Design an enzyme around this catalytic site. Structure first.
Site, PDB file in Angstrom:
ATOM      1  N   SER A   1       0.745  -1.084  -0.134  1.00  0.00           N
ATOM      2  CA  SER A   1       0.211  -0.036   0.008  1.00  0.00           C
ATOM      3  C   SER A   1       0.467   1.126  -0.024  1.00  0.00           C
ATOM      4  N   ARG A   2       0.444   2.026  -0.744  1.00  0.00           N
ATOM      5  CA  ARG A   2       1.141   3.432  -1.031  1.00  0.00           C
ATOM      6  C   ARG A   2       0.537   4.026  -0.322  1.00  0.00           C
ATOM      7  N   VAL A   3      -0.746   4.369   0.616  1.00  0.00           N
ATOM      8  CA  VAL A   3      -1.429   5.102   0.927  1.00  0.00           C
ATOM      9  C   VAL A   3      -1.155   4.470   2.649  1.00  0.00           C
TER      10      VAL A   3
END
Lengths: 83, 499, 468, 187, 50, 85, 236
Positions: B366-368
């Site tokens: 996940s880049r969040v």
């Protein structure tokens, strides 16, 4: 039907208007549709194969395709020059 | 009689005067009628044939306008008058689509009649810019522990669901929708995510099962099922995610939140391939159109968490990509992988090894990530990431005469692997997710036998529900864990572990 | 008074029929007035017969064939000035930061052929970086193209911020961050960061100028963002005589955009899909990045390798243009070493005994040899035991682990971000620092008293604090 | 520029001809010679209909041209230059096509609109007049561009009528209404 | 109930041949002529309203 | 080849490596099937060759294992010896 | 089939053979029709042609139609787009592996790769589900351990593993069920075991109640009664 390069409207308009050739088209040309770094020129009926032609835009090119009614020069240089 | 009622409806249609700009089909082949006429026509304009078929006009050529017929050519014939509907694609948007299974135009295929539609908005529109952005932090809890801890994301954000073909890809997705019921029940409209499942190229029976399941979990009352079925043709399929997105804009614009699950863009691609090849456009890499990237980039950038200034709203998205035998190097995956803010990668071995969810969390990213997720759950799951990391590395050491250190890891790690199994189509409440992971963190589950993990789990939850429902309510309401709360929680876990 | 009516809109390829003898020239820019403001089409062919073929940089939806077009007469002229510093500008050259109309004195064409052989500098030039690691193992060059490797997760953006800060102290230069295929999330974060790190001060000036090209923005505009950006940089270099540093984001998405425009033009996609004009487009672009006699444009570009296939032609072509590669790794970031530079994978072609000096080279070589031996030594030394090290070998291990810690700059942009005051260390003092460590003069100061510590002078203080 | 597109090709001849003869302004004359040669071509069957079927040489085409100028002694030498051009282009098949297209350009230059009231019936002259009146009353006949309105019999358009002209139609045929009516009563 | 549903479909097919019959009746009668005159004047009114 | 494979009732793959291995004519009977069973096979030969297939199939598995050269049990080496002959 | 489903109302069981031929045929005339060939030369209209065929076949409130469609998977590659597209479009997949045929087992099915719309938990019965979960794990383990056995050798496995291997080999040959249509093969008369009986019998095996039964006494014999009977037969 088919679209031949001589069936181009500018070519056709001269032809209907009679003759206008002879040196104008036998040893000089006037450029047609252009882009893709090759230009399709009308005339130059005398033109050595792989001659160097100088366009009126400074740029010079080497004739590649001698076709019946058109010559397809290859532009040795930038196309912004050509129109 | 039914005969009289039908007659009445038809009888009530009379008088034409709309037709003006005609076209005449020159040749009709491949659902690509080519018209000389329709001189003034908008691009992707809706056109109505003599047959009645509707189209968009992708090719506007100097002497012919290449209409793309949305329907069958069975009733279409050559030379046909082509009335000019005069509207570029627009779809009803409004609150009425909640509890509506609709076809692409919007015609309910569940036949729930008229739609409460507060706008007709164009389907192809430009995405929220840099200025339409607020910081992302709003939890998205799918009720799946691995997702919620290992790979969580915020609202308005992308995150791929790239995984093995029909391994309950839809099942993985469906789990989230069910968890959205819990928040939905709550009044707050930041807690009302109005879900949209976008069924692209999917059998009407399969979606009927989906619909039936949704009705069973009463999820229909915030669900919208945008349906472009297998039978529904490639133009509808091409516009199907875009059209769906527009619906999402209405909720988002109202400042509300919603979640749109595009399932699957792999079938969307093929439909675009069909369109492009038939429009004789040169096909891109892996015989999938060259500007398929352009389609995907437009679609996937519409998911956005808007600025507080321009009203805080969101439109979370979760595209689904079907891996063709687990291929992630394929052109459609590679492009999508770049655009997306996270990926979840399902894995066949895990599925076989009975790990359902079969998510391989190593290949999930996940880049969040931790920016959104409950603070409480963050506290008790930093450890979890590290523990699992060791378990993965020391996984291959599982096959003899093994070091004590490795063996300890294996005990903690194996119990965790069992713990992240969840019976699909059952989500969990976060206020009880936090306890289960906490136990694991306190390593009291090390003392629990693998088979007995499952029984332990439900029992532990019930024990917490009777004994420490003060704790459960505190965890829920505080949403954060004080040292005193973690203390009390540990006591409860110890007590339960003892029994 | 050039006007023409649209005679095709097959995709985003709009053929326009222009009144006779008023026909464009190839590379002209056309503007079609729309309720979308304008749509800018760039003439990339003449189909003749008083018709042309143009590409669009904006979407073409809802167009009606026959719309009037107006011809600007050449490649779009985008506003330039120090005014345009700290302004986010879309491709067409209009504010998307929307902090009022972009005030500009001069505007300049986005295309512009590379400087002459004579104009380009005949000898090497070095660009300084406050980061010691950069200045040792891969020294920059003022005309140079240095291609960044390693994710934004490692803090690519922080590295980028760091360079802007360093440039401001170093020269007082300028920068232009051009972002190609930029996620709206990433753009927001960057704008927010840029405001925060004061490289954009909303009130007051801004070092960095922003040109953002989002992924959603059409492939044609994706292709043209770089050349526009280059013109801005060139206005600084050529017309403000000042060294610049121009970031580019993914050059993969530069390639992808170019590849698409080729396919749209109908041209035969060359090997591995990539445009037949792949080489030439980079050639023009990265020869407008050079050290002129009046300035030098340095460019940091990001190479998004396609599934790590360096073998693929698009990376290879890029690497040819690139002079140095800085290879950030997450392992390094995980060793707490910020910068995140993987020292055995960072190389520059300006690292030489001549170019950066014999002393600099020798110091670098020894340090490199030390690190190279250290890593290899640690492989079986760790497993077999640290006691397997000889006195000489553990002298090296000690030195290496001391160097490893000494590398980490608690640098200024990330003064907040790591929480530790910045260190901008000048080039002369960088060489000096490593010479002393090579002579093992601080092999009496333990390795953790260099952790997150700057240069030689700095670790005098830390040595004192270590004792105290 | 020529008046109106020819929806492309074959009209490239017509356009060229139009503009070439436009500067001599002899468009009516040209049209008349084209009509005259066209009528006697149509009323010639072997190589007046099989000349519309390609198979002829360059040399044989040239000799056909020589026969053609017997068919009209003079009258617009631009269409006689066009004949040479077409023989030289080695196709005279789409000859009447060019003639028709030139006619469209010509009568556009004159300013004439063409319309039709297709029915499966030959309508009343009273009907013709009332519709003609209506069309003149409407802004559709702008005046300057005249109205020709031809009722045609097309059994295919069984019942009702459809008025067509200038990409403006009104179609109150029975067939279309029947189609819609029938279909919905199969629901 | 099944046969009742079948009967609703059957009614539609009964009515299908009724459409065919009525089409034949319109095209048979000089209602074919007289209503074409009606269509003519209706189009005159429509087109006059343009 | 794909087209033909569908049309035919059997495939009789010959392997080049096995040509070199010394079966000349070569065979490659793992990629050779006739799904029309023992029809048009002489009755005597059907009786005798009944477990010939089983032996060979077992040999194929066993031979692969044997190449890894792990400590083989006698049962595998019975197969291996039988198969080889 | 539609006439049967609709007009006669009767449910049926459609059988089509082979649907790769349907694909192949369509691909060919697409080319002739001049359509630009898609991936691996397949028709661009492949999806919709398959789709129309599948969509037509359905359980309605007029009937039920149970298609069994043969599919030929060229060179046993399901990564080939034509099989893969069909793989989505069908509801009850079966993979018939050459290897399993060669093992002499008929069924030739790959058991881990069989999947069906109905292959649930409670819907197939809790017992059925649990039994099947145990079977799947046992076989999956056996397959995983095959690599370990390959290099390290059989002997380096644990007792628990050895019991699992022994059960797996027994289960492997208990999946073998003779067929009537292998009276033209083996001659051996088919055996068909009712569903309830199979669930019960497999449960026993897994529990190891029939680990006192030889491996070859499961091989090419049907139900539990047969397995026991062949155990007696081999015994004497």
């Amino acid at each position: 039907t088919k679209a031949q390069p001589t069936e181009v409207s500018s070519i056709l308009e001269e032809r209907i208007k009679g003759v206008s050739d002879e040196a104008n088209l036998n040893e000089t040309g006037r450029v047609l549709a252009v882009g893709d770094g090759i230009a399709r020129v009308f005339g130059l009926n005398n033109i050595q194969a792989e001659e160097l032609v100088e366009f009126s835009s400074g740029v010079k090119g080497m004739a590649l395709n001698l076709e019946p009614g058109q010559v397809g020069i290859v532009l040795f240089g930038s196309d912004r020059l050509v129109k | 009689e039914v005969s009289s009622i039908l007659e009445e409806r038809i009888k009530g249609v009379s008088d034409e005067a709309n037709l003006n700009e005609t076209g005449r089909v020159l040749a009709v082949g491949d659902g690509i009628a080519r018209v000389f006429g329709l001189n003034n026509i908008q691009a992707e304009e809706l056109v109505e044939f003599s047959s009645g078929v509707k189209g968009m006009a992708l090719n506007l050529e100097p002497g012919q306008v290449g209409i793309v017929l949305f329907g069958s050519d069975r009733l279409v014939k050559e030379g046909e008058l082509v009335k000019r509907t005069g509207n570029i694609v627009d779809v009803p948007v409004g609150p009425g689509l909640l509890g509506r299974v609709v076809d692409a135009l919007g015609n309910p295929i569940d036949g729930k009649g008229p739609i409460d539609a507060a706008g007709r908005s164009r389907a192809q529109v430009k995405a929220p810019g840099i200025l339409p952005r607020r910081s992302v932090h709003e939890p998205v809890q799918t009720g799946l522990k691995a997702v919620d801890a290992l790979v969580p994301i915020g609202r308005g954000q992308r995150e791929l669901i790239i995984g093995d073909r029909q391994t309950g890809k839809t099942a993985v997705a469906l789990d989230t929708i069910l968890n959205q019921k819990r928040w939905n029940n709550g009044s707050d409209e930041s807690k009302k995510l109005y879900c949209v499942y976008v069924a692209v190229g999917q059998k009407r029976s399969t979606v009927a099962q989906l619909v039936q399941t949704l009705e069973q979990h009463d999820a229909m009352k915030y669900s919208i099922i945008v349906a472009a079925t297998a039978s529904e043709a490639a133009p509808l399929q091409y516009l199907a995610p875009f059209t769906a997105a527009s619906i999402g804009e209405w909720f988002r614009d109202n400042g509300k939140h919603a979640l749109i699950v595009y399932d699957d863009l792999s079938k969307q691609a093929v439909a675009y391939r069909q369109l492009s090849l038939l429009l004789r456009r040169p096909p891109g890499r892996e015989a999938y159109p060259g500007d398929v990237f352009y389609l995907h980039s437009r679609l996937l950038e519409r998911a956005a968490k808007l600025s507080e200034k321009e009203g805080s709203g969101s439109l979370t998205a979760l595209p689904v990509i079907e891996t063709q035998g687990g291929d992630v190097s394929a052109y459609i995956p590679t492009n999508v992988i770049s655009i997306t803010d996270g990926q979840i990668f399902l894995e066949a071995e895990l599925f076989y090894k009975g790990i359902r969810p079969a998510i391989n969390v190593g290949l999930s990213v996940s880049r969040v990530g931790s920016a959104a997720q409950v603070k409480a759950l963050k506290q008790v799951a930093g450890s979890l990431k590290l523990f699992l990391a060791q378990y993965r590395e020391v996984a291959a050491f599982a096959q003899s005469d093994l070091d004590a250190s490795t063996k300890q890891t294996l005990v903690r790690g194996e119990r965790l692997t069992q713990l992240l199994k969840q019976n699909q189509y059952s989500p969990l409440a976060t206020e009880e997710q936090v306890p289960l992971i906490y136990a694991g963190v306190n390593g009291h589950l090390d003392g629990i036998e693998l088979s007995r993990i499952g029984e332990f789990e439900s029992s532990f939850l019930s024990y917490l529900k009777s004994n420490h429902n003060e704790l459960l309510t505190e965890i829920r309401e505080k949403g954060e864990l004080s040292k005193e709360l973690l203390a009390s929680l540990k006591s409860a876990t110890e007590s339960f572990v003892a029994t | 008074p050039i006007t023409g009516k649209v005679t095709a809109v097959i995709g985003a390829i709009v053929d326009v029929h222009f009144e006779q003898s008023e026909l464009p020239a190839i590379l002209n820019a056309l503007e079609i007035k729309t309720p979308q403001g304008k749509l800018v089409l760039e003439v990339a062919q003449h189909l003749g017969e008083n018709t042309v073929r143009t590409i669009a940089m904006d979407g073409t939806e809802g167009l009606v064939r026959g719309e009037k077009v107006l011809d600007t007469g050449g490649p779009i002229s985008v506003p330039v000035g120090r005014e345009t510093l700290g302004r986010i500008i879309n491709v067409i050259g209009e504010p998307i930061d929307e902090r009022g109309p972009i005030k500009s004195k001069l505007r300049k064409p986005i295309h512009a052929d590379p400087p002459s052989f004579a104009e380009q500098s005949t000898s090497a030039e070095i660009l300084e970086t406050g980061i010691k690691v950069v200045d040792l193992l891969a020294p920059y060059a003022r005309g140079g193209k240095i291609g960044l490797f390693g994710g934004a997760g490692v803090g690519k953006t922080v590295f980028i911020q760091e360079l802007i800060n360093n440039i401001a102290k170093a020269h007082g230069g300028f920068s232009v961050f051009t972002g190609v295929g930029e996620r709206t999330r990433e753009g927001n974060d960057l704008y927010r960061e840029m405001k925060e790190t004061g490289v954009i001060n909303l009130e007051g000036e801004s070092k960095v100028a922003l040109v953002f090209g989002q992924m959603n923005e059409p492939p044609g505009a994706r292709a043209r963002v770089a050349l526009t950006g280059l013109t801005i940089a060139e206005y600084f270099r050529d017309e403000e005589g000042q060294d610049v540093l121009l970031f580019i984001d993914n050059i993969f998405r530069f390639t992808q955009a170019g590849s698409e425009v080729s396919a749209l033009l109908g041209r035969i996609p060359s090997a591995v899909g990539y445009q037949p004009t792949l080489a030439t487009d980079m050639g023009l672009l990265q020869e407008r990045i050079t050290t002129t006699k009046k300035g030098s444009v340095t460019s940091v570009q990001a190479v998004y390798v396609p599934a790590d296939d360096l073998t693929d032609p698009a990376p290879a072509t890029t690497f040819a243009h690139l002079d140095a590669t800085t290879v950030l790794s997450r392992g390094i970031s995980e060793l707490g070493i910020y910068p995140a530079v993987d020292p055995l994978d960072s190389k520059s072609r300006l690292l030489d005994a001549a170019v950066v000096g014999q002393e600099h080279y020798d110091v670098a070589s020894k340090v490199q040899e030390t690190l190279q031996t250290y890593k290899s030594l640690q492989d079986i030394i760790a497993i077999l035991g640290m006691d397997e090290l000889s006195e000489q070998d553990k002298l090296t291990v000690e030195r290496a682990r001391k160097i490893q810690r000494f590398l980490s700059q608690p640098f200024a942009v990330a003064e907040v971000f790591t929480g530790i005051p910045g260190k901008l260390v000048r080039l002369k003092d960088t060489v000096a620092s490593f010479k002393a460590v090579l002579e093992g003069k601080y092999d009496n100061i333990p390795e953790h008293a260099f952790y997150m510590v700057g240069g030689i002078e700095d670790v005098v203080a830390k040595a004192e604090k270590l004792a105290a | 520029p020529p008046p109106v597109r020819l929806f492309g090709v074959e009209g490239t001849y017509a356009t060229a001809l139009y503009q070439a003869a436009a500067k001599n302004s002899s468009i009516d004359a040209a049209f008349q010679s084209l009509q005259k040669v066209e009528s006697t071509v149509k009323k010639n069957p072997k190589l007046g209909h099989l000349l519309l079927n390609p198979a002829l040489s360059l040399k044989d085409r040239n000799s056909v041209i020589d026969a053609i100028v017997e068919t009209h002694k003079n009258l617009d030498g631009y269409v006689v230059n066009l004949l040479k051009v077409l023989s030289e282009n080695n196709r005279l098949g789409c000859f009447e096509k060019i003639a028709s297209d030139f006619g469209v350009l010509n009568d556009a230059h004159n300013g004439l609109l063409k319309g039709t009231v297709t029915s499966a019936e030959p309508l009343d002259p009273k009907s013709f007049k009332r519709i003609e009146k209506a069309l003149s009353a409407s802004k559709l006949v702008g005046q300057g561009k005249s109205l020709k309105l031809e009722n045609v019999v097309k059994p295919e358009i069984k019942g009702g009528l459809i008025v067509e002209l200038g990409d403006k139609t009104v179609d109150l045929s029975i067939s279309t209404k029947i189609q819609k009516l029938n279909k919905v009563l199969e629901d | 109930v099944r046969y009742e549903a079948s009967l609703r479909q059957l009614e539609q097919r009964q009515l299908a041949k009724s459409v065919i019959s009525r089409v034949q009746s319109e095209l048979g009668n000089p209602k074919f002529q007289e209503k074409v005159l009606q269509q003519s004047i209706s189009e005159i009114e429509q087109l006059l309203s343009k | 080849p794909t087209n033909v494979i569908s049309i035919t009732d059997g495939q009789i793959f010959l392997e080049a490596e096995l040509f070199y291995k010394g079966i000349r004519p070569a065979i490659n009977v793992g990629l050779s099937v006739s799904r029309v069973g023992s029809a048009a096979q002489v009755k005597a030969l059907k009786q005798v060759a009944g477990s010939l297939k089983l032996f060979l199939a077992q040999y194929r598995e066993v031979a692969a294992f044997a190449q890894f050269g792990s400590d083989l049990d006698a049962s595998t080496k019975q197969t291996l010896v039988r198969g080889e002959r």
